[PDB]
Amino acid sequence: NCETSCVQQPPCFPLKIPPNDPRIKNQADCIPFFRSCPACPGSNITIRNQINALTSFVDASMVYGSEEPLARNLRNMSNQLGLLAVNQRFQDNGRALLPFDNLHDDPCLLTNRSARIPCFLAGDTRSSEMPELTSMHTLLLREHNRLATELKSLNPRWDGERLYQEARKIVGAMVQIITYRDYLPLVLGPTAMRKYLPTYRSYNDSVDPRIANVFTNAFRYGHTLIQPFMFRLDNRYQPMEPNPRVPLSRVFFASWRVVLEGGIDPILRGLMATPAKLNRQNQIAVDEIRERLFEQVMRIGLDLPALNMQRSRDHGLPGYNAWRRFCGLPQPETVGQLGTVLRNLKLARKLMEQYGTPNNIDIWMGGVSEPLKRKGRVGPLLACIIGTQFRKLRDGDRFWWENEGVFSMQQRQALAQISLPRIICDNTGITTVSKNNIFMSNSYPRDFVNCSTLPALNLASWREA
Amino acid sequence: VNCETSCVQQPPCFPLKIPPNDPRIKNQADCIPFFRSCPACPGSNITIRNQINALTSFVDASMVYGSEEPLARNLRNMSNQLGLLAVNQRFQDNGRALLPFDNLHDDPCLLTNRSARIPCFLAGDTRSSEMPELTSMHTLLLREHNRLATELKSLNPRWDGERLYQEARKIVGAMVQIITYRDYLPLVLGPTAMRKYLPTYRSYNDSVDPRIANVFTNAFRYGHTLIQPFMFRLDNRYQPMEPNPRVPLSRVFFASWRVVLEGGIDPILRGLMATPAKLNRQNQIAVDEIRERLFEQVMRIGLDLPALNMQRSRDHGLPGYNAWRRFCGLPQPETVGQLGTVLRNLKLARKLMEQYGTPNNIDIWMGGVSEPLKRKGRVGPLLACIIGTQFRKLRDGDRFWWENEGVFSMQQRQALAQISLPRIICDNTGITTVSKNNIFMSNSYPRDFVNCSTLPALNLASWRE
Amino acid sequence: CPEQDKYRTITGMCNNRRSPTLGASNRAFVRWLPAEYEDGFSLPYGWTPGVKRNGFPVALARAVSNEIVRFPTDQLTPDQERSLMFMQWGQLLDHDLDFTPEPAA
Amino acid sequence: CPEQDKYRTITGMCNNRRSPTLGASNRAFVRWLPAEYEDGFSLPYGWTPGVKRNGFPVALARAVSNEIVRFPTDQLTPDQERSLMFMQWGQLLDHDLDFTPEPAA
Amino acid sequence: ANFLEHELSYIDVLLDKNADQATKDNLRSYFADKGLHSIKDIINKAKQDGFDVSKY
Amino acid sequence: ANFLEHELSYIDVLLDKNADQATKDNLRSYFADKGLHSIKDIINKAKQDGFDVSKYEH
C-alpha cells in the first residue's frame, strides 16, 4: 500500500520529509514511492536489476505497442485497410481521436468528474499524462491512417496486414529522422553530436541496442524544459478562450480537455509558438512538477525532481564521479574543483552541503547541474550518456531506415523530405506552422510559414506491380 | 532425470550425443553425461540465463582457505591459538602434514582403489583430489601456511591464533600472486601480450571490475592441451621411482590413496619439475587419457574433456569464435581461405568448416586452442586477449593486491620479492634438489637443477612487533 | 528466429539474430557500470537510517530538491532558441525507448 | 562494509567498497558479450534437434572432438621450454579463480 | 482481459446481415484469440466489463 | 553439516582430563557454531556421519 502508507516495507521506499519543508508541514507524511520491479524477484544471489517493458529501438512502439495482444487491440480489425483503431464516440472537428482505454483504476476520470472522459489507449500506457503528449500520440495515429489510405489507393491488392506493416515502417522511419536529424543535434550541440553520433555507416550486429539502466534517469534531463502552463492558441495564434494558460497541475491525465475543450490543434499551436523553459543552474525545475505533480488524481502532490533522485537510488546507480569517469571526464574531489567543473562555485557549495562528496551526487541532479554545451541543452556528462545511448540504438538496429535493404534508394530519397511541420499540416486543421527546425522556431509570426510551402511525402516509389 | 545414468535430455541434463563412426562408443543410443551449470535466477523466463562463480575471483589462495565462512573455519585447527590449518589425523608423509580428509556422501576417491579405502581430501576448493599432482600443490601450500604461522609465533609471541592465521594467510596469498604474475603468466602470454595486457602496475583502481567473466571459465581451459597422459614419479636422484613410475592418468583421477600410501608428495613434485609439459600442436591438441577415459574409474563411462568444454560453452550461451575475435580487436575470417590464413593451416580450417559451417559458430575453446601460439607463449592472440584482460582486472581491481600502498610495508614487499616456488618446495618437503628459476621453463635434470641451500629463504624480520 | 523477414516484430525479438532478446520488450536493462546498493545487491542507499554512502550521510531526495532545485517559478527564463515542442518530442521519444514497471497496489 | 579493515574477508565481500559483491563468492559471472542461446534466453545451441545456429547445423561436440582433437598418443610432442609444473600451476590457479556449480545426482 | 469500448463496433459488424463472410471471420478469429468464441460470449464480456449492451 | 574426520581429535581434547580450560571453551564455541551443543550432540553427529565413537564410550 505504498500509495497511502508511509511505512517503509518492501516494495515501498517512500520519500521522507525534511524539517521546515516549504510545502509539506507534516513531517510524519511522505511522498509515495514503489520500487521498480526486480528482474529476478526474491533472489539473494543476483544483483537486483530493473525491467524495460518497451522495445529499445526507435520504432514508434509508443504508437504500435511493444506486446502482441496490445498491438492487435490498437488495430482496426473490421476491414482490410490496415488502420489503427480510433475513438468511436468522439471526433476532433471530424478528425480521429485515440480510442479509450478500460483501466480498473482510471486516473483521467478524477481530473474533471462531471465530464467522465477516461484515459486513452495507445502503444504506451502514459499517453494521457499531459494533453500535449496526447496530441503527439493523436498526430501519429492520424499519420498512420493517412499513409495506409494512400498506400491502399496506390496498391489496391495489398491486404490489411501489408498496409499496416508498410505504414508502420514509414512512421518508424519518420520518428527516426525527426529524432536524429532535427532533435538530437539541439540536445547535444554540434561538438557532442559529431563525437557521439558520427556519420552512419551500416548495421553492426555486435552493437548492443539495449537501453542502459542509467539512461532511464539521465534522459529525464527533459524535466528541466517543462513550462508550468499548458498554452492553447487559436487559428490566429492568439490565446484560445476560455482557458488559454492552464497550470500543469490541472492538465495531468486531463483527457477531457482534448475531447471537450477544442481538440489537438490549439495544443499543437501552443507547442510551436511558446518557448521551452531554459535549464539554468539556479532555475532547475518548476513548482508545477516539484510541488503539484498529479495532485488532482492522488492524495498528495509529488515532486518529480525528488522522485528522479529516489529512483536512481532504487536502481542502484553509481554517483556523479563514477559516471564522469565512465565518460572519460575529470572527477572533482573538492568544492573548488566542482566549482570549476560547473563554472559555478555557488552551486558547487550547495551540492557539497547536501552530498558531502561529488562521488555521492545523484546522476540526474549532477547531470542537470552541469553548464550546457554550446548550442545544446545538456552538459558533457549527459551528452556522453545520451549520445552513447542513441548511437547504439542506431548502429545496433537492423531496421534502421538507412540500412541497406530496409528501403530502396528511391524510398530513402522520399523519406528525406519528411518533417514534423508537414506531418502537422497533413493531419490537423492547422494551416500555418513552424519553419524548420521546429525545435528551435518558437515565435509567431516571425518563425512561421504556410503549409502550402511545404512539400508532401511522395509515396510513388512504394507502388508495386 | 539422473544425468549420470540416463541419456534423456530433460533439465538439468544436456547429454552429449554420439556421432556415427565414433572411435570408442559404437552405440548411438548412448551418450556422454552432462549437467547444465546452475542458473543465477532459476526458473525465470525474463532474465537471460547466467551461471555462478562459487569462489572469490581474487588471487587470494581461496583454494587453500576456502571462499565461504563455515568451510574456512572447518579448515582451521581450533584446538590451540597457533593459527594453523588442520592436518590429516590418521596419516603423515614421512613425518610431514597431509590434507585432512573430507566426508562426502558419494566419495569418488573411494571408488578408484576399493581395498585401500582412502577418501577424498578436504581443502579450500572441492577439486583438490582430482589428480595427485594437484593434491601435492594443495598439500605444499597447507604446509607453507603452518610453517609461516610457526615462525611468526616464535617472532611475535603475544600474537593470538586469529592474528597468526591472518598474517600467514596474507603471506600465502601474496606468494600465489607473485608466482602467478612474475613467473607463470609471461610464459602463457609471451612477452608482447604480457606488456600489452599487463603493463607495469600503478595502484589499486576501485573502478576496475574484478569479477571472473563467463568466457574466462572456458578460455582458461586452454591448459587441457598441456596435459601429459601419465603421472610421473621420481626418487631423490630424480630416477623413476619403482614400481609405478608412470601411471596412466585414467588411473590417477581422484586416486587420493596414491598420495597417502604410495610415497607422498615428494615423488610427484619431482616429476612435475623434471618432466616436460605436452606441447599443443594443431594436429595434436589433446590426449586420449582425457578425451577418451576421463574419470573412467569412478563413473559408468569415460568422459571427453575437450567435448565437455564445447558443450559447456554452449550451456553458458557463449558467442562463437568471430564474436570473440571482434571483441579482442582481431580480424574475423568469413571464408575457409581466410580461416586458413588466420590458423596458418588450410587443412584445419577445412576440418573446422566441415564441422561448424562458419567461423562465426566455432566454439570458443576449440577456436582458441586451434590458433598458432604467440612467440614464447602457449596461447594464440585470441586466448591471450581473454586471459590477459582477465588477469589485469584481477590485479588492478584487488584492494589487497600485494603491491598496493598500505597492504604491506616497503620492507615486507622487499622480502616477498625474494620468494619463489622452488624455495617453497625446499622449505616443506624432503626434496633437497630443485628446479632453477623459472620453474615453469626448467624441465630437465640435472642441467636445470640446484641444491636448496643456494636458494635464499623468505626473511620475516619485518613482521616483528 | 526466421532467417528471412521483412518487418520488425512488435516485441523487438529477432532484431539481433545472434542474441534475439536484445532490444526486445520485458527484459532487464543493460548496466554500463556495476550497481551500488547499501547491502551490495538489493537495498537502495537511503534505506537504513544511519547507514552512510562512501563516508557521508545520504541526503533526503526531497531536501536536495528543496535546497537545489526549487526557484521562484515566475522568474523562469524563456529559451530563445527552443520551442516547447522540443520538450514534448523528448517525452514522446522517451516513451518509445523505456518504461520501467513497478508493482501495483 | 567496515570503513577500516586489515585482512581479506573469506567470501571476498567488501574488497570493492562501492560495489561490495564484486569478486565475492556465490555471485553471477560478468558477461563481456551478450549471451547466445537457441531461444534467446536459456536453451543451449544443440538442445532442439534441427535448430540451426546462425544459418548452420550445430556440430556434436563429440564429433568436433573426434575429427579435430583426437591424435595418436605416440606422436605426442614434449615441450622443450615448459615443465609439467607449468600445466599444474595453471590448474591450481584456475581453482583460486572459478568454480561453476552444477546440480548433484 | 478488459473489453475495450471501440470493440463494441465489431459486435455491430458481426450482427450486420450485409457484412461479408471474410470480414466477420476476421473479427471472430480476433475475439477467439481473447477467449471469446461466439457473439454471445462477446456481448457477455462487454456487459461484465461495464458496457451498455441493451441494444443487443 | 557433515562431521569431518579431523574433528574427532577435538572430542579427545574436550575429554582430556587436564587439558587447558580455555582450549575446551574454544572448541565448545566452535561446535556451538555448528549446532552441536553438548559432547553428547557432538559424538552423536560423528556417529550418524559414519565415524566410530565407540572409543569414547568407556
Ligand SMILES: *[C@@H]1O[C@H](CO[C@@H]2O[C@@H](C)[C@@H](O)[C@@H](O)[C@@H]2O)[C@@H](O[C@@H]2O[C@H](CO)[C@@H](O[C@@H]3O[C@H](CO[C@H]4O[C@H](CO)[C@@H](O)[C@H](O)[C@@H]4O[C@@H]4O[C@H](CO)[C@@H](O)[C@H](O)[C@H]4NC(C)=O)[C@@H](O)[C@H](O[C@H]4O[C@H](CO)[C@@H](O)[C@H](O)[C@@H]4O)[C@@H]3O)[C@H](O)[C@H]2NC(C)=O)[C@H](O)[C@H]1NC(C)=O
Ligand atoms: C580505472 O579503471 C577504469 C576502468 O578501466 C578499464 O579497465 C582497466 C583494467 C584497463 O584495462 C583500462 O584500460 C580499461 O579502460 C578507467 O575508466 C575507464 O576509462 C576509459 C577512458 O576514459 C573509459 O572509456 C571511455 O568510455 C566512454 C563511454 O563509452 C564506453 O561504454 C559504452 C557502453 O558499454 C561502450 O559502448 C563504449 O565503447 C565505451 O566502452 C569503453 O571503450 C573504451 C575503448 O576501448 C575502453 O577503454 C573502455 O574500457 C570501454 N568500457 C566498457 C567496458 O564499456 C567513451 O565515450 C569513451 O570514448 C569516447 O571518448 C574518448 C574521449 O577521448 C575517445 O577517445 C573515444 O574515441 C570516444 O569518442 C571512452 O572509451 C571507460 O568507460 C572507463 N571505465 C569505467 C568503469 O569507468 C579509469 O580511467 C582508471 N583510472 C585510473 C586513474 O587508472
Ligand SMILES: *[C@@H]1O[C@H](CO[C@@H]2O[C@@H](C)[C@@H](O)[C@@H](O)[C@@H]2O)[C@@H](O[C@@H]2O[C@H](CO)[C@@H](O[C@@H]3O[C@H](CO[C@H]4O[C@H](CO)[C@@H](O)[C@H](O)[C@@H]4O)[C@@H](O)[C@H](O[C@H]4O[C@H](CO)[C@@H](O)[C@H](O)[C@@H]4O)[C@@H]3O)[C@H](O)[C@H]2NC(C)=O)[C@H](O)[C@H]1NC(C)=O
Ligand atoms: C561493431 O561494433 C562493435 C562494438 O562497437 C562499440 O559500440 C559502437 C556503437 C561504437 O561506439 C564502437 O566504437 C564501440 O567499440 C565493434 O567491436 C568493438 O571493437 C573494439 C575495438 O576493436 C573492441 O575493443 C577492444 O576491446 C578489447 C577487449 O577489452 C574490452 O572489454 C573489456 C571488458 O569489458 C574492457 O575492460 C576493455 O577496456 C575493453 O573495452 C581490448 O583488449 C582492446 O584494447 C587493446 O587493443 C587496442 C588496440 O590495439 C589498444 O588500443 C588498447 O590499449 C588495448 O591494448 C580494445 O579496447 C571492443 O571490445 C569491440 N566490442 C564488441 C562488442 O565486439 C566492432 O569493431 C564494430 N565493427 C564495425 C563497425 O565494423
Ligand code: HEM
Ligand atoms: C508532461 C511532461 C512530463 C511528465 C508529467 C513526466 C512525468 C514523469 C514521471 C511521473 C516519471 C516517473 C517518476 C518515477 O521515477 O517514479 C517520469 C520518468 C521519465 N521521464 Fe518524465 N515526465 C514528463 C516529461 C519528460 C520529458 C520532456 C522527458 C525527456 C525529454 C522525460 C523523460 C523521462 C524518462 C525517460 C523517464 C523514465 C521512464 C521509464 O520508466 O523508463 N519526461 N516522468
Ligand code: HEM
Ligand atoms: C589433471 C588435470 C585436469 C583435469 C582432470 C581437469 C578436468 C576438468 C573438468 C572435468 C572440468 C569440468 C568440465 C565440464 O565443463 O563439465 C574442468 C574445467 C575447468 N578446467 Fe580443467 N582439468 C585439468 C587441468 C586443467 C588445467 C591445467 C587448467 C588450466 C590451466 C584447467 C582449467 C579449467 C577451468 C578454469 C575450468 C572451469 C572451472 C569452473 O568450474 O569454473 N584445468 N577441468
Ligand SMILES: *[C@@H]1O[C@H](CO)[C@@H](O[C@@H]2O[C@H](CO)[C@@H](O)[C@H](O)[C@H]2NC(C)=O)[C@H](O)[C@H]1NC(C)=O
Ligand atoms: C468540466 O467539464 C465540464 C463538461 O465538459 C465543463 O462544463 C462545460 O464548460 C464549458 C465552458 O465552461 C461550457 O461551454 C459547457 O457548456 C459546459 N458543459 C456542461 C456539461 O456544463 C467544465 O467547465 C469543466 N470544468 C473545469 C475543470 O473547467
Ligand SMILES: *[C@@H]1O[C@H](CO)[C@@H](O[C@@H]2O[C@H](CO)[C@@H](O)[C@H](O)[C@H]2NC(C)=O)[C@H](O)[C@H]1NC(C)=O
Ligand atoms: C590398491 O591399494 C592396495 C593397498 O595399498 C595396494 O596394495 C599394496 O601394493 C603394494 C605393491 O603391490 C605392496 O607394497 C603393499 O603391501 C600392498 N598392500 C596391501 C594392503 O595389499 C594395491 O597395489 C593397490 N592397487 C593397485 C592396482 O595398485
Ligand SMILES: *[C@@H]1O[C@H](CO)[C@@H](O)[C@H](O)[C@H]1NC(C)=O
Ligand atoms: C475502421 O475503419 C472504418 C472505415 O474507416 C471506420 O468507419 C471504423 O470506425 C473503424 N473502426 C475502428 C474501431 O477504428
Ligand SMILES: *[C@@H]1O[C@H](CO)[C@@H](O)[C@H](O)[C@H]1NC(C)=O
Ligand atoms: C593442531 O595442532 C597440534 C599442534 O601442532 C597438532 O598436534 C594437531 O594434530 C592439530 N590438529 C589438527 C586437527 O590439525
Ligand SMILES: [Ca+2]
Ligand atoms: Ca521502441
Ligand SMILES: [Ca+2]
Ligand atoms: Ca580466489
